[PDB]
Amino acid sequence: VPAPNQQPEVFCNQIFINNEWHDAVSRKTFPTVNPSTGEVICQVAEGDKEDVDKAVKAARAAFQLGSPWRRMDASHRGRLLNRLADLIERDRTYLAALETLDNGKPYVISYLVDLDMVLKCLRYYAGWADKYHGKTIPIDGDFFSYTRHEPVGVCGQIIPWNFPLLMQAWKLGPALATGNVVVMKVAEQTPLTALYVANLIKEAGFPPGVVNIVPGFGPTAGAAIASHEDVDKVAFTGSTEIGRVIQVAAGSSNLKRVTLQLGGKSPNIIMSDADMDWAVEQAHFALFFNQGQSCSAGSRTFVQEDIYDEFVERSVARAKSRVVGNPFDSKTEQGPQVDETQFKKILGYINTGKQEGAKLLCGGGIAADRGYFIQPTVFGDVQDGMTIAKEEIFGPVMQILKFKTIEEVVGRANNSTYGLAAAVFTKDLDKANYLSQALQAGTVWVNCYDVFGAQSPFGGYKMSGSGRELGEYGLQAYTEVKTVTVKVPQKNS
Amino acid sequence: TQAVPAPNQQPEVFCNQIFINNEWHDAVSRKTFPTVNPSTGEVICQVAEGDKEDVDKAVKAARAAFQLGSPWRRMDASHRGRLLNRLADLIERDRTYLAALETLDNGKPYVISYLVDLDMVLKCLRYYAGWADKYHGKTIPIDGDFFSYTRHEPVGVCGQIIPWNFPLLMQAWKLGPALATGNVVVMKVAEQTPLTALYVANLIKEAGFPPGVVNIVPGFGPTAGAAIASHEDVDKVAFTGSTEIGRVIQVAAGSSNLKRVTLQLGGKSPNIIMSDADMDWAVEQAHFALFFNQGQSCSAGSRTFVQEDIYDEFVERSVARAKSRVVGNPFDSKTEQGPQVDETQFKKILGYINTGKQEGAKLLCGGGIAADRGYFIQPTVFGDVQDGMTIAKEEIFGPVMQILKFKTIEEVVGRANNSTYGLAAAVFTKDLDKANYLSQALQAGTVWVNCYDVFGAQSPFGGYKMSGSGRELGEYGLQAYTEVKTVTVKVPQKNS
Amino acid sequence: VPAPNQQPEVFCNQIFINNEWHDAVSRKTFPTVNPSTGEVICQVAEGDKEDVDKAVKAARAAFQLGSPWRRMDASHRGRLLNRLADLIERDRTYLAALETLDNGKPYVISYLVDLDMVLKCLRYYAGWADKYHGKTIPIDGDFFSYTRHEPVGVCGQIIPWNFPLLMQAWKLGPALATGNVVVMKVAEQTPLTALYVANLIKEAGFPPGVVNIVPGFGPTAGAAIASHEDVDKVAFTGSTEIGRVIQVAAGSSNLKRVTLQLGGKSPNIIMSDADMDWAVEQAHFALFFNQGQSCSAGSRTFVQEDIYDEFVERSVARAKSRVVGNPFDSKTEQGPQVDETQFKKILGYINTGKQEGAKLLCGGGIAADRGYFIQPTVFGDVQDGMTIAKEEIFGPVMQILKFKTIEEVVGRANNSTYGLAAAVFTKDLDKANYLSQALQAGTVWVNCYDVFGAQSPFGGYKMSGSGRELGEYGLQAYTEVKTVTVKVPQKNS
Amino acid sequence: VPAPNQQPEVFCNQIFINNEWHDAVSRKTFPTVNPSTGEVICQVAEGDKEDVDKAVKAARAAFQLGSPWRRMDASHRGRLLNRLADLIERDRTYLAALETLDNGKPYVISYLVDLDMVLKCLRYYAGWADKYHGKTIPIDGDFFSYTRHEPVGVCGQIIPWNFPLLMQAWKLGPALATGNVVVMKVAEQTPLTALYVANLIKEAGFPPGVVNIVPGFGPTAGAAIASHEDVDKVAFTGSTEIGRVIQVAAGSSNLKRVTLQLGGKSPNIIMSDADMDWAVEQAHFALFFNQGQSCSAGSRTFVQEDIYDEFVERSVARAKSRVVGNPFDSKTEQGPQVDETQFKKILGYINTGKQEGAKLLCGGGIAADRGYFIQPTVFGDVQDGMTIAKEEIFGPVMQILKFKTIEEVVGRANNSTYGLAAAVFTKDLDKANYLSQALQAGTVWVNCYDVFGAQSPFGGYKMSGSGRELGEYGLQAYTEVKTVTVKVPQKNS
Ligand SMILES: Nc1ncnc2c1ncn2[C@@H]1O[C@H](COP(=O)(O)OP(=O)(O)O)[C@@H](O)[C@H]1O
Ligand code: NA
Numbered sequence A, C, D: 001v002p003a004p005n006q007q008p009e010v011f012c013n014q015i016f017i018n019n020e021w022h023d024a025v026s027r028k029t030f031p032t033v034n035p036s037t038g039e040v041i042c043q044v045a046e047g048d049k050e051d052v053d054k055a056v057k058a059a060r061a062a063f064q065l066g067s068p069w070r071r072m073d074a075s076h077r078g079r080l081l082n083r084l085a086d087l088i089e090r091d092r093t094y095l096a097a098l099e100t101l102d103n104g105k106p107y108v109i110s111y112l113v114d115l116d117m118v119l120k121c122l123r124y125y126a127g128w129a130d131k132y133h134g135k136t137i138p139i140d141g142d143f144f145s146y147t148r149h150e151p152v153g154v155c156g157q158i159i160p161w162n163f164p165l166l167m168q169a170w171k172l173g174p175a176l177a178t179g180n181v182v183v184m185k186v187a188e189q190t191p192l193t194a195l196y197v198a199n200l201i202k203e204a205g206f207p208p209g210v211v212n213i214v215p216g217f218g219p220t221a222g223a224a225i226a227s228h229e230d231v232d233k234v235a236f237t238g239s240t241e242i243g244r245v246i247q248v249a250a251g252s253s254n255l256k257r258v259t260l261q262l263g264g265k266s267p268n269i270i271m272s273d274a275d276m277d278w279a280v281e282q283a284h285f286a287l288f289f290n291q292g293q294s295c296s297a298g299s300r301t302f303v304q305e306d307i308y309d310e311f312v313e314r315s316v317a318r319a320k321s322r323v324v325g326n327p328f329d330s331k332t333e334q335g336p337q338v339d340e341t342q343f344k345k346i347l348g349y350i351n352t353g354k355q356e357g358a359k360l361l362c363g364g365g366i367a368a369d370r371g372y373f374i375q376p377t378v379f380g381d382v383q384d385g386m387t388i389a390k391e392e393i394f395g396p397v398m399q400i401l402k403f404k405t406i407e408e409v410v411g412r413a414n415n416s417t418y419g420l421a422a423a424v425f426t427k428d429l430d431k432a433n434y435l436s437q438a439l440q441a442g443t444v445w446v447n448c449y450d451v452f453g454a455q456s457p458f459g460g461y462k463m464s465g466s467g468r469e470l471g472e473y474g475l476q477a478y479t480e481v482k483t484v485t486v487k488v489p490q491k492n493s
Numbered sequence B: 001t002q003a004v005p006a007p008n009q010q011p012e013v014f015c016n017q018i019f020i021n022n023e024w025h026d027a028v029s030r031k032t033f034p035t036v037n038p039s040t041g042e043v044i045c046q047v048a049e050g051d052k053e054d055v056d057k058a059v060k061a062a063r064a065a066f067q068l069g070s071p072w073r074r075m076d077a078s079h080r081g082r083l084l085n086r087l088a089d090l091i092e093r094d095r096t097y098l099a100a101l102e103t104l105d106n107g108k109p110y111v112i113s114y115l116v117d118l119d120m121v122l123k124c125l126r127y128y129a130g131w132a133d134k135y136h137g138k139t140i141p142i143d144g145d146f147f148s149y150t151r152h153e154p155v156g157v158c159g160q161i162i163p164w165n166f167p168l169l170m171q172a173w174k175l176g177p178a179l180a181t182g183n184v185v186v187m188k189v190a191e192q193t194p195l196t197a198l199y200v201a202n203l204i205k206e207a208g209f210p211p212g213v214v215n216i217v218p219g220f221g222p223t224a225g226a227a228i229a230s231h232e233d234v235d236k237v238a239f240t241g242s243t244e245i246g247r248v249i250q251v252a253a254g255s256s257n258l259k260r261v262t263l264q265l266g267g268k269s270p271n272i273i274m275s276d277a278d279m280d281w282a283v284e285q286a287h288f289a290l291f292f293n294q295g296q297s298c299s300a301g302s303r304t305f306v307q308e309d310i311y312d313e314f315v316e317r318s319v320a321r322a323k324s325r326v327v328g329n330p331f332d333s334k335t336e337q338g339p340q341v342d343e344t345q346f347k348k349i350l351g352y353i354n355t356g357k358q359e360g361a362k363l364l365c366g367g368g369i370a371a372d373r374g375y376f377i378q379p380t381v382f383g384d385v386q387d388g389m390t391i392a393k394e395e396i397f398g399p400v401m402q403i404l405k406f407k408t409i410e411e412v413v414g415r416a417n418n419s420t421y422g423l424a425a426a427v428f429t430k431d432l433d434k435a436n437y438l439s440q441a442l443q444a445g446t447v448w449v450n451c452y453d454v455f456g457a458q459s460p461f462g463g464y465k466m467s468g469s470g471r472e473l474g475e476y477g478l479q480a481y482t483e484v485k486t487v488t489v490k491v492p493q494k495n496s
């Protein structure tokens, strides 16, 4: 990795509409903070309802029949996405540093993981631009019938702060591949990197109005998008509680299409026949990755009783050795949490676990004086009824539960209103096949964890969300299917 | 051959209760409600009035039949196909009976119930039976030493709420894809037309579907229907009906367990007649487009746009056709139009007709009540209709035709698209470029060219805008009943 | 299993054209023999070139634009296929008995396997009739581009004798689903059941000429179809030897489309961690099923050296216990071979096994005084270079080979010009994944064998064939893709 | 359009194997000529069987399990195809001139059409590299069944001289996207541009052996490919004559998989209600494009009797004004024919046309003293039974036929053993729909001609070929489908 600029300059901090930069109508700004220091990085235009209104009008205009964007060859949408990826890669080092500054994650990870996954996401979806065929259909009678795969239209996209660049990419990729237009609301904690990418969107040559980004707060800017009478579809990633607000707001306004990707309490199951070294390291990664701030974190580590003690001992050892510090320091494995709000929410869950009888094995406290750093925390002898075993913590807090039989762990892992991910570690062919089929989760990993690819869909069962992102499936929510049924003189096979 | 067997005009009712675990239950409250014959306005029988407690019992049954290792989960996908095919066979066995009961309860002409509704039900179930073992998931060439793939699982417990305009067909549109994909059902049928759907439940048991796979709770909307939309253990609701209630369905889902929602709502579909259309065909098709099923179709061509050069001719012919349209007893062979489904719709349509006269639309024929018994309305045609008129914007859902004049093709595109509805549209023209341009330009879920109301199980149906979300029929109608699971496995060495 | 009629009466023994029965033009007939007794069942019309020509004309006229078959709704093709299935299920015991009479396979197997698979194949493909969509395609420019999935046309279908009814179903299913017409040439060894199905095809209501069946010999009737100038497509199942003749004939005639399913020498691989009891019975079934007359037979049983001796001893014991006898007797597991030619060929390979030093562990001789019964035969210590280890025997003769490492057995299994099927028995996930990927075989079975379904495609790698049958894939060779590209006033997404 | 180098240098004229240049084993060379002058451009290594043998070994080795190419991420195969197109675009101006130098087509066309389509083809297929999913299949019983989409392996690719670079890209795109390796035989008339791309294939970073190119003659190098025992699949494009030879060699050797794209005699149908101006210009393009050297050329122009005289009148005027000259002169619409052999053959056909009673309306002779230039030639009053209305001329010779009715024109247009393309020009929706359905041709254009897109498949009905290239369909022939069926403890939906 190239040595980072530990204080990268900010070039974009305004509202992005029609390929131009605007202050908020109200002229208001809000500060974004460095989670490693607690210091203000800069101010950013505080978009609200009136700003969203302007973004939607611009998106609506670019989606007009006969416009440059509507008329553009599908294959050229691909060229543009590929160009956007090239421009992102050109500026990879700057963006990786900016991502760490605003979010707190280690710079090595921003560079090698986040930025790499963004490039791969955009390059993958570039390929889909001219391949998502409709159908010609053998209907009865003297008719020829077919479907057009058309864009859904103006798409509001509301994204979180845990993976700012990658969440932006996950949203823009499929939306732009299918010819939609976007009004994006980035997280108030991490607006900067997505604003810079907006400039690259312009540089890549996307028509004005095709992508519009409105930085600002949720109940203001986000709520305005979700309630807007001229937004055709909304895609939301965030908390389960705001997912309700979004869905309610859609039904209360114009019945716009909705998809959601929410939180989880994903079970990581370690059978007695698992490779212990690999299972311990993967279980550590499964929980602690990205400061524990992953919707798919394996926050319920089920370990079979015969290997429980050894697993726990090893897990505690690895958690005590996890390096917490300056995310720009290459030795650092764990940066700070994203903000003070999350910081406190995690301290409350830690205290909760102690009160309700969970066994604190290591960590459990504040790791430093400045910023929002928390010690890697491991709870043992966790029971299903416990709050730390039911609710998403979104911090470096690991729960280890013991089980006995394979049919028991099935019932206990499935006993949840969440269903985002799950994992099984075993060497047995039959146990893996039985578990992968039995687990009620959108993604099941066998002998691995947090393996994402732009090709394989991702999304939740139950209250972890609805619909899928990534892969071919990710195009479905961005398609309005039109049936054209034509009277013909004589139908033949 | 399209000949119809003489109907029993007073078909016996065998089923009038809540169907749960392949058995008939009274409402927990023991309360019942009357279903009425709209031809006379008189009660046919009492039906058990399912409420939230009855829905709870239905959902627990569905959940149990959906347990891993259950007969329905373990059943071969191909066998699900055979059960759907068996159910179709049974419905065909009782076709003459089912058609008559559909007419008794709903009001539509018997010849249509037999030749159209029952036919379409058969074709829909037989279509989706074939999908049972063909809706493949994928193996996916993901990066690295991994083998990744998707399982296409069922969503789970599916709440299904349907209207009264096509009681049997709406039931089939729901059960076909849901059962094909291995789901279980709690269905809430319209209070106006519960009977035929309940008799089909009897055939479901006879065909050998495991107990709890399909549960039907007859009853009212805000009671039974809302209990389903808000239930904490229903995974998915699919609703057909008014846009207004669709909102309620979506809010209830977000307010409860964030269940998956698909909707098929109302419309105000533009039927567009270019000056180069075949006049005779366009006239008869537009008449059918509006007046089909007593005007009680969500996709009715309730804005007939006619190019100015053929406006006068088209209107004269449409009025003549509407005047000759026979209204009467649906079991009578002469009848093209039966009564509206109930008194509420009856007065509601009459209300819209009055507004049409009020706003200056020319009443060209009909406009009133057609008989002093039942809910019959005269076939009504309004001419010189303008975009801002109430009858031009709101769904009437009755035999009331709006005819509007236009000049250019650019004009008619903007006017037809100027609607919060977008369920269907049509274009009548002989020109290749005009048909292609209009079919692409119209913001509607289904666009018909030189025809109208051409539905097929193979072709997807659903709305743009506020006419719904998602699609039914075809391969697409399986997407909402599928839960996709990605399985990603570490392998020793990935090779192409 | 309902009781059989061990002397079914024959209703059809002529040439089937335009739904009517015809004698051969030459009026010649040929005997078909009951392989259990060696007695002549009846005479069958001997179709040749002139008869094939009349069939091709019948088919060609049924395929003309505006004909009942071309105009028929796709869904109705599904109705007709389901009706034929119902008619076959009605006459199930009759056809299962006639299959056993003419072929030799046990009645219990004819009834429970062959006929059940026939019904499931036809009902599966009935579902496909109206679901094999073409595409609408986002081409560059102001154009609308789509594809029509039309039928390929007059299909010549040449089938073998090992699974007379099933092989017929495998051909008719996909061809009729997609609206093609058929000239079918059935094996001279087993013509009766297929000719009876023709009667049911008529009864079901298929239009005249949609299916035409010409019994007769290969070099006469078969070659006539293969070289025919008005046959658009040929599909052949049989020996690799004759596969070449088909492919040469097609190229020398009208360049008709060709798909082939040919022989095999399929490896069945038993790892030391396999379930012994299961692997032994399954290896036995893998080789011995259908009197060893299966293209996918596990004719190379590779066994890991740690379990070799135990596996061999158990296999020998199971082979010695395999009941040979009257196929109508409920206890018979193995009937006679199909005819004298096959009978002599199998004895020849057995002699070859002894001559080359393979260890004859049991069987090896003639098992009855009349008919074509051969003792269940097992060779041990088989080497890759032996003839019985290289060539397809198509009889109750088993080859057991010893191996040491997983990479050794991969190279050894793949060292063949055959590649139709393979199997792996193991409890280990990683081994199972590595082997299924490494093996160059059309179907790889894991902890099972000979598991077919109409849903999953089947066909060979290398010289075991080209193309696939069954599943959605089986529709590909029976479709002719037409692109329609239309100029439009203005292309919009 | 960038000013061309009228005499571009040749850097590559040898055999390409393992990313290295070789002389032929025989050390022999052959001349390639500039068809505009008749002068030799340079000598090219004359590959034969012995050289084909080295290429196959290199390809086979490159395709071995565990090789860099077999292990490479599917998405990365996409990066390589994109990189290859990037390099081709860098060298676009040079390649366009060299294409013109060796082929004779106008430089303006090479640059704007040929090179543009090459870039679009390669980039389209780069998108397919990680998206051509196999299936998970709901088979009966306690089993999990799925398909892997594997490469077919060593693919022999034999191409002609009419679109040298585009034919190469049509073959390489789908082959490399799906993980295959290639032994390509370019036409002796136009080897140079494909040889240069090979240089760029090395530079792009494709592993050695993945693409090997062998220049040389047909009956030597090409036959060696079709007859080779370690070539799994062959794709051929060229004459119907040689297509037969390829198929026979395939069936005679190792039963390699075969797909063909052969000649045509495509009907272009002008209804009386067609836009006269558009139809006249399109019909001119349909025939005369690329010096008449297109397999899909509209060489049967059917004009309705009511507009015949005017259409002919306007077509003669256009033909008479079509600029023949130096392909590097921007005003040139038609360069020379590819070589003296085609030159004489076309002149021969012209002689036949006059002899058989066709009415010569203009052209009919040589257009220059130097090179192989032919006057744009129009025959009127052409009848279906004339040699020039039946046989593929492959030159600037136009056939105009008169018809009365729709039914008549369907019969006459379909009365051909060719079926590659067709077109209908009409303003009427029903006529267009009836005709596009009734026409037995691989591609049907409506109110256009020769509209190709990498997204829409291309291939012939009848003896114009088998299988399809371009689009999703173009991946089918480059995929070997493997079914993996696994026994599971308990199958659930
Ligand atoms: N007998 C043959 N076997 C294999 N390939 C051949 C044979 N003859 C020609 N070819 C090759 O096939 C390609 C197409 O050639 P061909 O069909 O002869 O068209 P043309 O005759 O117009 O050159 C060329 O690359 C040529 O070298
Ligand atoms: Na920040």
Ligand code: NA
Pocket: C032, C033, C034, C035, C101, C102, C103, C188, C189, C190, C191
């Ligand atoms: Na026989």
